[PDB]
Design goal:
4 copies of one chain form a homotetramer. Chain A has no helices and 12 strands. In chain A, strands 1-12-11-2 form a 4-stranded antiparallel β-sheet, with no helix packed on it. Chains in contact: A-B, A-C, B-D, C-D. The structure holds a molecule of 3 linked components (MAN-MAN-MAN) (3 copies) and alpha-D-mannopyranose (MAN). Chains A, B, C, D: This is Mannose-specific lectin KM+.
């Protein structure tokens, strides 16, 4: 097995751990949100063809959003968000409350969720996010990234 | 796009170029041979699951072989073979006449084909072959490799 | 030119930009601090031999510290700190107020400086910090990292 | 420790092993030759500045050559040569008899030495030679390469 620089998890130890692994790039990101981030799944690029990563779906009735990147001219240049406990859960471990994505083309996708708690910011000067890692219970407990050149 | 160190092609400019891309590792290699190498296709590992790469099948009635590696404890440590023209074709053009694979566990698979022509040898001290690239017409004209850590 | 995954800068646009480049690893880190981080320089490993990176020295009369890692068994597992403006300066741009280093061996070096402002945290699950990048004026305005496998 | 894809050695087990390690690129290559390759040393690029690698000098009275690449627009695209025993020596083990270097700019540097024995060829489609490894006794017994993106 090859390996990739893996950075992060930002968030808490709750939920179940998952790792989608590494691919060639990112085409589309799908997440649900309200006061925190619920569902999270992505459509990766695998050597030129779209490839659906495993779904990390949340049952909560949250609003869905689809982030379509203009692969391969456009790619994530930074990932940022907020982690903190959430009040509505039984629950006391930190969870990803908010997520914000910035592109090399200057596009910004939201702040989805409540911008409340402790802040995390991953600005990328050189390199590509090539896969996601994280934890999901009823919501998105933690998020992590795999990177390559 | 991520990229990988791509080394080679060994062989001639004949046939049609193909690139299977990059993956997480190699599970199984299938090739056909007689006096030269005909068919070539591989089952890669993609983040823990087997993944069938495109088939680069030859129509010649050659003998088929299946090389099953004990992924992930066992992996290719070296690739070697012979390149040279092949009388039976009218072509020219050099083609892969022979292939030999050595494993980190000490297993050697063949010499498949005629050990005739100009020799090529890729001994790997550190790193993993993570995908194949090459050219196929009626037979395997050339072969190349993608590598990662 | 080879390149490395370069992540961040955390901090402000003040001072002058510098990039020490990439090496084989990190042996020793030298910084000065008080209410903010002043000086910053490192002794890298270059293929087995110690190598002094350029000095990014601050003139402020701050307390000096030397962080000696037990290379190569011990290496940085995470970098974290605080960024915010600093009253005592004439310029209003954010500066690195605090820095904290955690090792794979479980050693934690400080919080050096004032743990005041906006927090940044870089937990590393796989990979190695292999060089630093940043900005220095009278103090350490920003800090960034180069990474490899 | 960071690591690099290391491919090779081509040649025999004679002499003493050496590894110059990894750098940012290659600026200049110095070798001596006659019927085989004698001396071998290189001036690497280390983050923009020239850096002399260890000398692997041969005492034989061979002809010296200096290969100056136009770093960083020009870089090695392939390394090839011949390995075989050499009568003039007392020891019977294979040695590097010949070396040939090709540039991305289309320049070819020699065939230095006797093009006699078993051939080796490393064509690079993507990636950079970033360091050399090998064995030296009275002559160059073996040669290997470190690669990066
Ligand atoms: O046996 C469990 C637990 O059940 C009760 O809690 C139920 C659920 O309440 C929800 O609010 C939420 O807290 C759930 O927790 C999951 O999801 C979160 C967020 O993804 C994650 O942090 C957790 O680890 C869980 O995977 C709960 O399951 C109560 O009866 C309680 O006392 C009891 O321990
Ligand atoms: O010399 C012109 C400069 O004079 C005044 O600044 C003097 C210095 O005041 C210190 O407090 C500090 O602000 C210095 O600034 C540098 O260092 C900080 C921190 O590293 C950095 O953010 C800045 O970009 C500077 O490199 C000042 O030099 C002011 O009147 C100022 O406006 C004037 O330019
Ligand atoms: O000193 C002892 C040595 O004597 C005879 O060898 C002397 C040398 O003869 C040379 O011509 C050559 O074979 C040397 O070998 C070195 O260099 C080669 C080429 O780089 C390398 O392959 C070898 O490993 C050596 O480093 C000899 O040193 C023989 O009787 C010999 O067996 C004895 O050791
Ligand atoms: O593959 C061997 C040979 O097969 C056919 O003759 C053609 O496709 C050639 O271009 C190719 O070189």
């Amino acid at each position: 097995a090859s390996q990739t620089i893996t950075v992060g998890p930002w968030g808490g130890p709750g939920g179940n751990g998952w790792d989608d692994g590494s691919y060639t790039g990112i085409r589309q990101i799908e997440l649900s949100y309200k006061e925190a981030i619920g569902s999270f799944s992505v459509i990766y690029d695998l050597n030129g063809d779209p490839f659906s990563g495993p779904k990390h779906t949340s049952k909560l009735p949250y609003k869905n959003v689809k982030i379509e990147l203009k692969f391969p001219d456009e790619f994530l240049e930074s990932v940022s968000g907020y982690t903190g406990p959430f009040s509505a859960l039984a629950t006391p471990t930190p969870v990803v409350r908010s997520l914000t994505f910035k592109t090399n083309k200057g596009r910004t996708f939201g702040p989805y969720g409540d911008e409340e708690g402790t802040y995390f910011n991953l600005p990328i000067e050189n390199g590509l996010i090539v896969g996601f890692k994280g934890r999901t219970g009823d919501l998105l407990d933690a998020i992590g990234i795999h990177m390559s050149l």
